[PDB]
Write a protein that binds this ligand. Structure first.
Ligand code: HEM
Ligand code: HEM
Ligand code: HEM
Ligand code: HEM
Ligand code: HEM
Ligand code: HEM
Ligand code: HEM
Ligand code: HEM
Ligand code: HEM
Ligand code: NAG
Ligand code: CYN
Ligand code: CYN
Ligand code: CYN
Ligand code: CYN
Ligand code: CYN
Ligand code: CYN
Ligand code: CYN
Ligand code: CYN
Ligand code: CYN
Ligand code: ZN
Lengths: 148, 151, 142, 59, 141, 109, 151, 148, 141, 142, 151
């Protein structure tokens, strides 16, 4: 169960029906839902976001943060057919997450689960299996060198 | 089976591999690349160099070693081109495993290393290189070749 | 299912795919109408003013388009509850006084839910559409 | 197809259940058992109206 | 003064240049090629990402990050709160590096030079400069 | 004909029609309940499958659309000649990429 | 629905409730228990006693009040035995709610109290008493009976 | 979502595959894991368990403590069909926890979460939903009269 | 002197008496019935838990706690560190109450009297007294 | 998955359920063997000494039992890494010199992972078993 | 053959042996018992301890020796469970005899001693122990294992 080329092409194709707009509203709503799920399942992680004002989920800071995530994921997926560049960006994102203490691999497994829970609610014909097989690949690279 | 070295994975690998051999002196390039890979392997794991004594690795510019680099590169080319036909590929790779079994001193760790070296080199020479597909497939290929090794 | 924030987003996207490209829009509309009138032919009397007897008449075309426009505002504002409430109140006012049995709204729903997958032909969710339609229709009724 | 009669766990009245065989795998190296995949459907007349309760299963 | 019609226009044209993945990469790379060609004084700032070699993976990943952030800001152009938050976030990512504030004008210069090659429409230079400046102003101290 | 995406990579596929529901108020797009039956015998095992699926027939396009029943984006689409009706071409398509990855020639049995 | 007063909950409740009525003078026991519950309720919430004026609560040993204790105990017995059939139970409980609505002065607080009293008594008389199941179910039963009360 | 009789019977049945032995090894391992999780998510609580040498966690003292917990939970579960006795033991355990200052209800919600995270890792066919629904019942009684 | 085979035997027989939930409660209750029958001088100590009424919930819960602790100690019989720790923990739970140290011998007496009724095997009295004493010794000061 | 402390505990418990009751133990063993030899029949030549040609022979029964005993020591010591390492080294020595392709170990794994759920029939985890088997097999190979 | 370790003898032995391994930490018990037997053998006949140098007997709580105690206990368990099938038992015991032959220094007297120690320990741990049957059978088992010893 690796991340096949078909899986990557699939994800790339379905991706423009999950958010993707000249406006950030869908990104905010969906990413927001992903984190509501994450915090519901791993509430300890919610403390890691006070810098971006999780306590006030309608704040510009938190919105802008969600958009930062969404666009980060966008960047990752867009790089699926450019493995070298994907590797560099993956490393970059990883270090960005190492600077933040308290962020664990377990939290990443968690967010994978919440993504998998949220995406099929916002778009039909979303290949969940493909998503899982590929996310494992992305996260395992981002979240290595973090506390287990 | 699918997912790990899938159909499209194999298509990508073949298409990208095809880029290297454009001109009439493909032999020169195969020899150069094979020589690079092998000598790099002998540097990384020094105990390996002795295993190539019968192909005159001490004179890598020499005849015998050049012909040998052609041997490995052509085996690699063959196995890549055979990825359309899994059964035939499996048979060829099995023959290779047999051949590497008859060379005592060859170990799986050597194949792990040569995998690393191979991917590192291919990232350079190939302008378009899908690491996911290549690694997915070669895990299986090199796996099968090293499958009959004692150590 | 129920009209979540999420499933509302899904319905919204699918409605974009179905309605937003004014090509077969009047035909989409008219298909919905042929289905509705096929289920409850007695309802044609409510549309005398707008030529319900002939759904190919320009007056009825204009009508069905007005409808789909209203419904479009409703769907488009599923994620903007204030605006949604506003449009729903407006539609409700436009519909009060007219003796419309739940019967007819079920006909409308069934029509929409058969023409929609014929339009999209692909990835669509009849449960989400059922939920959100129920919300909008409840809004129009009271 | 058959009638399910509940007397524990759930508080359902008597109702139809279907076991729908969807696939089988029988390894030639282990024929002692057949690995079955199936869909379990139940017609529940829960709240005045009828509703299907189905799930995917394996064994 | 980046008004409704301005930001709407910029949003559209941006969608033209960045919304298609088949020429997004060419777009980024050419933006950088131009920038570094006409202002090589700038290249020193990008040693961390091989700015001397834009055809490298390091720099490619960089340019990708750039265009992504630019996408975020252009997309938040209508949400003043989240906009301000995002622009201060960009500020934090740039303030640590001693960046000549008039380099942003040059960046805009390269952007406007490269853009029409990826636009099926005529570049609205007014809208673009106005919005780009309402972004850069926030990035700068 | 060709095939590089289906799970079992079978020689042949039997499509069995089980039921047809035609809405009186929308007769142009009948709904079918069909089963996709596959029987593949490899070395390691023998696999048999009967996948219940929902389908729509489009008179407009002379086309059967069979929605996937398993957890892959794999749908079956049968294009009719317009005049034959005892033979269609069954293309297997990723519901998402729209990529055409398998084709079978179906005949009425 | 399940979890709150589940199937097994109901089975437990019925099985344990059955223990009380072993012999032929079950009427004596029902009257005693009902009289206990009711007079205790009238003591705990004194405003209640007036509501039973028409059944002669001032003479709890008397005919009318005894017959009445039989009324409540039999309604309770019926509702317990009806827990197999949720729809019929719901209908019977609804009839009870109607009956208690037609008695102005009856309030939900009275039902909360009688719930407490009931559970306290049952803990004593029953040798085997699963409080979780009993409370789970009676929350719903007494809930439904008090559902049509003005206060 | 209460704690049904079925849930209790379920838990009682599955319980003999999670630790339960004439030897304490499994109890120590599993309970130990539960607390590793707890402290990972609510590190402030780790300060309470010194007396028991939380700090050196191979200390006969800490082992014996873990075993005390495991056996306490055992006692609770075994009393699921004896509600009166369960109530008394629940009260007893509660007071034992009131004597310890710094122990909050939040810490109890936390340990519920960590139990729910650990148990399905050590035994298959463990009914997680049942466990949650019943634990809520146990903890809410133990941890009332404590501070949120 | 509670050696390997001793503690192994005691572990097994204990599993017989306490490992089955259907007769664990009868076991505890009968242990107490016997103890209080043959040494009513002891009952004063248990006023906190209605020792005068062993059929009460208070005392039931008590006996349950007892058997639980006894289970812990018997189970820690092979882990000397954790054993000592557990036995000193039991000590702390008993030292506050003025308990005649020869009451433990009586407790063991009742235990040995009740045990064979719940053992499908023959009671190994030697092993049981030896291990019980290596426990009580630690409980006492 | 990977061989956690926890999933090791799980595997250990399930192995208890499957192996510890010497009733059908030789039959369990032999089932494993029939499956293995069915997958890779060429491997029978490695077992000439112990009558691999007839898995019902007393010599081969004795064999398969020796195997399951070794594997039992390995599983039983998953939570005692020193002892585990010891037993794995021992098995490795017993296996070195014998030309055993990874092929055959995959056959063994597949055999075990089909006979196990047939034995337990109920609550079992093929992923945990996959992980821990991989650990033990890697130990035996080197 | 019959009389000496008969069918019923074997049934008794198996049934009684089964009592030890009730719980999930049977490994702990096997290691404890094996360690006891072996160290006791090393005390009774001191020349023996040297023979277990390769399994680190000097650290009996250690890994290697624990794994080894599991080895012997599992061999014993296996041989007991194999008493239903005399031919298979004979084959397994023969393999064991081979294994003990390859350890020079192992003598029949050691097996006599370990027989004594074994029976003495089993009398304690087992609550039900038919010494006649056990000794009848183990005379043959231990006999066969020590049958290929030089001394
Ligand atoms: C699903 C893969 C994930 C992606 C693609 C992602 C993306 C991002 C991005 C783009 C940023 C902004 C960095 C910057 O602007 O410099 C960020 C920051 C951060 N991430 Fe993630 N993230 C992921 C998963 C996680 C997980 C599982 C955690 C654990 C809770 C986490 C914890 C954080 C924290 C604490 C920050 C700091 C934000 C701030 O303080 O402003 N991330 N992430
Ligand atoms: C990268 C995948 C590899 C391929 C495709 C490959 C292919 C070949 C081929 C075709 C031969 C010729 C055998 C013959 O015709 O007689 C050969 C020989 C040999 N290979 Fe490799 N090989 C690979 C990796 C390795 C590595 C990792 C080692 C470890 C040192 C190794 C050790 C040897 C040795 C010692 C010979 C003997 C050559 C001789 O003396 O004639 N091979 N290989
Ligand atoms: C949620 C689905 C529906 C929507 C969005 C909708 C919306 C509308 C709209 C936009 C108009 C135009 C009013 C105006 O601009 O003056 C209208 C009029 C009307 N609707 Fe609906 N409607 C719905 C369902 C129905 C139902 C089920 C019936 C019962 C058959 C119905 C009966 C009518 C009638 C009789 C008129 C006025 C005809 C005229 O203009 O003379 N509508 N509705
Ligand atoms: C409004 C136009 C601009 C946007 C949207 C933008 C956005 C970004 C983004 C998203 C990053 C990556 C943040 C990170 O490290 O995670 C970045 C980094 C950087 N930017 Fe900009 N930027 C802009 C203009 C400029 C200007 C004019 C300069 C001056 C040449 C500049 C110099 C740099 C440098 C030196 C870095 C970090 C290099 C590195 O990552 O090693 N940027 N910018
Ligand atoms: C424990 C659950 C209860 C049950 C099963 C129950 C049942 C009954 C029944 C069967 C009757 C006879 C009505 C008739 O036959 O016409 C009755 C009468 C009555 N109940 Fe209850 N009851 C319950 C709780 C309560 C409580 C808490 C109150 C508050 C004081 C209450 C107040 C009354 C009153 C005022 C009457 C009228 C007496 C009469 O005129 O005969 N009930 N109840
Ligand atoms: C899951 C329900 C819990 C049970 C069944 C349980 C069980 C126990 C037991 C049996 C003791 C031993 C008391 C004694 O023998 O004197 C104890 C002590 C203690 N408990 Fe818990 N516990 C639970 C949850 C918690 C929680 C969530 C916390 C908050 C961190 C907590 C904090 C403590 C502390 C600080 C001690 C003192 C230990 C000592 O000083 O030796 N407990 N618990
Ligand atoms: C080795 C045998 C014994 C064991 C394992 C044992 C264990 C225990 C345990 C676990 C408790 C509950 C601790 C608590 O929560 O406070 C307890 C309480 C108590 N024990 Fe023992 N004990 C033993 C022998 C005795 C003896 C011989 C006596 C003298 C009659 C005794 C007198 C008491 C008393 C008076 C209490 C507390 C009563 C209360 O809480 O109201 N125990 N014991
Ligand atoms: C992890 C799974 C395996 C375990 C636990 C295992 C364990 C054992 C054990 C305990 C012995 C007995 C040796 C002795 O008593 O001296 C043995 C011998 C042997 N094993 Fe394995 N083994 C495994 C997998 C395999 C594989 C896959 C093969 C390749 C077919 C293999 C080939 C052999 C052979 C040929 C023998 C000796 C046969 C003889 O005595 O004539 N083993 N192994
Ligand atoms: C109680 C009956 C006995 C049984 C069931 C038994 C069984 C075993 C087993 C299974 C092994 C492991 C061999 C291997 O896996 O390589 C072994 C090894 C050994 N046995 Fe015993 N044995 C018994 C009695 C004895 C006696 C009386 C002696 C005399 C000291 C002895 C001396 C040895 C020695 C020295 C080893 C060496 C193990 C090594 O070096 O790895 N055994 N035995
Ligand atoms: C399907 O294919 C197999 C050969 O691949 C054949 O034996 C079987 O009869 C075929 N069925 C039909 C109807 O073609
Ligand atoms: C991520 N934040
Ligand atoms: C290899 N050459
Ligand atoms: C609607 N008309
Ligand atoms: C910005 N680079
Ligand atoms: C009440 N009666
Ligand atoms: C809590 N122990
Ligand atoms: C002690 N009781
Ligand atoms: C394996 N022998
Ligand atoms: C014996 N060893
Ligand atoms: Zn069907």
């Amino acid at each position: 169960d690796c991340c096949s080329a078909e899986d990557r092409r699939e994800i790339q194709h379905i991706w423009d029906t999950v958010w993707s707009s000249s406006f950030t509203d869908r990104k905010v709503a969906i990413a927001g839902a992903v984190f509501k799920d994450l915090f519901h399942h791993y509430p300890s992680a919610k403390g890691l976001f006070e810098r971006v004002k999780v306590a006030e989920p309608d704040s510009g800071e938190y919105h802008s943060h969600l958009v930062r995530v969404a666009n980060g994921l966008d960047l990752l997926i867009n790089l699926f057919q450019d493995t070298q560049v994907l590797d560099k960006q993956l490393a970059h994102l990883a270090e960005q997450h190492i600077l933040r203490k308290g962020v664990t691999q377990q939290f990443f497994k968690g967010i994978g689960e919440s993504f998998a829970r949220v995406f099929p609610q916002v778009s039909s014909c979303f290949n969940l299996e493909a998503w899982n097989r590929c996310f494992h690949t992305l996260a395992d690279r981002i979240s290595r060198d973090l506390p287990h | 089976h699918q997912f790990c070295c899938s159909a499209e994975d194999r298509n990508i690998v073949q298409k990208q591999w095809s880029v290297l051999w454009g001109d009439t002196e493909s032999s020169k390039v195969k020899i150069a690349f094979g020589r690079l890979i092998l000598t790099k392997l002998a540097k990384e794991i020094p105990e390996v160099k002795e295993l190539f004594n019968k192909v005159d690795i001490d004179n890598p510019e020499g005849g015998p070693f050049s012909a040998h680099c052609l041997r490995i590169l052509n085996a690699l080319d063959m196995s890549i081109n055979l990825m359309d036909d899994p059964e035939a590929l499996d048979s060829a790779l099995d023959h290779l495993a047999d051949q590497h079994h008859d060379r005592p001193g060859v170990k799986k760790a050597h194949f792990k290393k040569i995998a690393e070296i191979l991917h590192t080199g291919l990232q350079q020479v190939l302008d378009d290189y899908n690491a996911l597909s290549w690694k997915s497939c070669f895990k299986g290929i090199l796996g099968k070749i090293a499958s009959k090794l004692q150590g | 299912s129920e009209c979540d924030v999420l499933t509302r987003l899904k319905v919204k996207a699918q409605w974009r795919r179905a309605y937003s490209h004014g090509h077969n829009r009047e035909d989409f509309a008219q298909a919905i109408w042929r289905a509705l009138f096929a289920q409850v032919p007695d309802s044609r009397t409510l549309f005398k003013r707008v030529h319900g007897h002939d759904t190919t008449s320009p007056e009825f075309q204009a009508h069905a388009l007005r409808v789909l426009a209203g419904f479009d505002i409703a769907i488009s504002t599923l994620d903007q509850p204030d605006a949604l409430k506003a449009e729903l109140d407006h539609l409700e006012k436009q519909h009060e006084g007219r003796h419309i049995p739940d019967n007819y709204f079920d006909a409308f729903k069934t029509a929409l839910l058969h023409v929609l997958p014929a339009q999209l032909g692909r990835c669509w969710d009849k449960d989400a559409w059922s939920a959100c339609f129920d919300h909008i229709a409840h809004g129009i009724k009271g | 197809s058959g009638t399910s009669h509940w007397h524990d766990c759930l508080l359902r009245s008597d109702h139809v259940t279907r076991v729908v065989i969807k696939g089988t795998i029988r390894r030639n190296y282990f024929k002692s058992r057949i690995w079955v995949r199936a869909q379990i459907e139940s017609d529940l007349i829960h709240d005045g109206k009828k509703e299907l309760s189905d799930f995917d299963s394996k064994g | 003064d980046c008004s409704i019609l301005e930001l709407l226009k910029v949003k559209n044209q941006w969608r033209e240049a960045f919304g298609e993945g088949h020429h997004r990469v060419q777009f980024g790379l050419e933006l950088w090629k131009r920038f570094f060609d006409t202002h090589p004084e700038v290249k020193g700032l990008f040693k961390g990402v091989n700015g001397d070699n834009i055809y490298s993976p390091e720099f490619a990943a960089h340019a990708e990050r750039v265009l992504s952030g630019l996408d975020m800001t252009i997309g938040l152009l209508d949400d003043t709160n989240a906009f301000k938050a995002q622009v201060t976030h960009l500020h934090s990512q740039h303030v640590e590096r001693s960046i000549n504030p008039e380099f942003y004008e040059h960046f805009l210069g390269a952007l406007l030079h490269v853009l029409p090659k990826y636009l099926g429409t005529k570049l609205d230079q007014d809208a673009w400069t106005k919005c780009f400046h309402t972004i850069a102003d926030g990035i700068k101290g | 004909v060709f095939d590089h995406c289906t799970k079992r990579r079978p020689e042949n596929i039997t499509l069995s029609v089980e039921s047809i529901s035609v809405a009186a108020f929308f007769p142009g797009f009948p709904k079918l309940h069909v089963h996709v039956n596959i029987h593949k015998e490899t070395d390691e095992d023998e696999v048999e499958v009967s996948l219940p699926s929902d389908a729509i027939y489009s008179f407009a396009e002379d086309k059967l659309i069979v929605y996937p029943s398993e957890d892959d984006g794999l749908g079956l689409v049968g294009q009719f000649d317009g005049y034959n009706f005892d033979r269609f071409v069954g293309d297997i398509i990723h519901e998402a990429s729209k990529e055409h990855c398998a084709r079978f020639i179906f005949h009425r049995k």
